[PDB]
Structures are given as C-alpha cells and as structure tokens.
Design a protein around this ligand. Structure first.
Ligand SMILES: *[C@@H]1O[C@H](CO)[C@@H](O[C@@H]2O[C@H](CO)[C@@H](O)[C@H](O)[C@H]2NC(C)=O)[C@H](O)[C@H]1NC(C)=O
Ligand SMILES: *[C@@H]1O[C@H](CO)[C@@H](O)[C@H](O)[C@H]1NC(C)=O
Ligand SMILES: *[C@@H]1O[C@H](CO)[C@@H](O)[C@H](O)[C@H]1NC(C)=O
Lengths: 49, 111
C-alpha cells in the first residue's frame, strides 16, 4: 500500500502505518487500516509465477 | 521516520551519510553529533572569501556545483560573472523537501 507513485530510482524505507480512511491510525490496524508491507509465499510446490 | 542526508566538514575531510537521523531543534557543531540507524550510503573525500554552491535532486541523483573566488567588498554579492564547475554526483535516492544549515557554535545545547 502506498499513497502516491514513485519517481525513478528512489527507494522507500518507512515502516509506519498508512490509513485507508478519514479515521486515524496510531500503531493499530483496527479502523479499516493495514500494514504497508506484507511478505511472500515462496513454496516449492508451486507453478511458474 | 524517513531517511535524511547530512554533509559535514570537520576541517580535514568530508562526511556524507544517508542514515536515519533523529535531529535536534537547533543542530550545530561545538568548536559533534550524527545519529545512526539503518543506512545505505556513506562517502568520505577531501568578509573576503566567497564560496557558491548549487544543489539539484533529479532522477535519484544529487547534483552539486561549486566555485570559490576572492571577494574584497563589504557586505553585498558581487557584480561580474563566473560559472560554477561540477563537483559530485551522489546516488542517494531519497525524497528531499526541506533543508537546514549547520554552523559552528559554542553553547552546547543539544535540546
Ligand atoms: C516527498 O515528501 C513530500 C513531503 O513529505 C511528500 O509530499 C506530500 O504528499 C502528500 C500526498 O502524497 C500530501 O498530502 C502532502 O501535503 C505533501 N506534503 C508536503 C509537505 O508537500 C511527497 O509525496 C513525497 N514524495 C513522494 C514521491 O511520495
Ligand atoms: C574529522 O576530523 C577530526 C579531527 O580531530 C578527526 O579526528 C576525525 O577522524 C575526522 N572525521 C573522520 C570521519 O575521519
Ligand atoms: C534497519 O535494519 C535492522 C536490521 O536489518 C532492523 O532491526 C531495524 O529495525 C531497521 N531500521 C529501520 C527500518 O528503521
């Protein structure tokens, strides 16, 4: 999840909560709120892609 | 919370770091401070004075242009013409929206 797009060759390292509504998020993912990073699922029993 | 840049002269070399700093309210150097957490880039290299600088931030690069000249006027900027050569082309890759100057002070109030 990200607010706006990126410019060329600039990176984003900021582990802070990003709100998807007018209600505030303060460290807690409760009121229609998520974490801006979620990991992968790399299993050997998968197809290509 | 986001990454910052810092250029510091110690009267013998140049320190350039892109670490995550939690700053003061008035930072300075006592005739000193730079925090450190989770960085990428680090660089080390080498009134009648007048030094001029130009900073640009385009396409993930940080352009710096420089020129020094001996002025001998009182309190203004001169009138002639002199062009500024390129200095360095650092690949820092951050977002820069504000800036602030670091002077040499005495009263070591670290806020
Ligand atoms: C670089 O930083 C600036 C300042 O933090 C960001 O500008 C903000 O953008 C949001 C929308 O994305 C606005 O709601 C704010 O008002 C802006 N703040 C200021 C001070 O202008 C900018 O988005 C950042 N760059 C990128 C690519 O995200
Ligand atoms: C900056 O200069 C001081 C002079 O006392 C020196 O001790 C220090 O090592 C220099 N900084 C770096 C990063 O080398
Ligand atoms: C920087 O990385 C270390 C280990 O990789 C981690 O413990 C720390 O939280 C990170 N700091 C950030 C992302 O500000």
């Amino acid at each position: 999840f990200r607010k706006s797009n990126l410019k060329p060759f600039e990176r984003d390292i900021s582990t802070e909560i990003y709100q998807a509504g007018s209600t505030p998020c303060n460290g807690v993912e409760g009121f229609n709120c998520y974490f801006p990073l979620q990991s992968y699922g790399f299993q050997p029993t998968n197809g290509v892609g | 919370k986001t990454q910052s840049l810092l250029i510091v002269n110690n009267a013998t070399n140049v320190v350039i770091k892109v670490c995550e700093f939690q700053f003061c309210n008035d930072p300075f150097l006592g005739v000193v401070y730079s925090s450190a957490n989770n960085c990428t880039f680090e660089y080390v290299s080498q009134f009648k004075n007048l030094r001029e600088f130009v900073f640009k931030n385009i396409d993930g690069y940080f352009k710096i242009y420089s020129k020094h000249t001996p002025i001998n006027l009182v309190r203004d900027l001169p009138q002639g013409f002199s062009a500024l050569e390129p200095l360095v082309d650092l690949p820092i890759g951050i977002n820069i929206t504000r800036f602030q100057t670091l002077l040499a002070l005495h009263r070591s109030y670290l806020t």
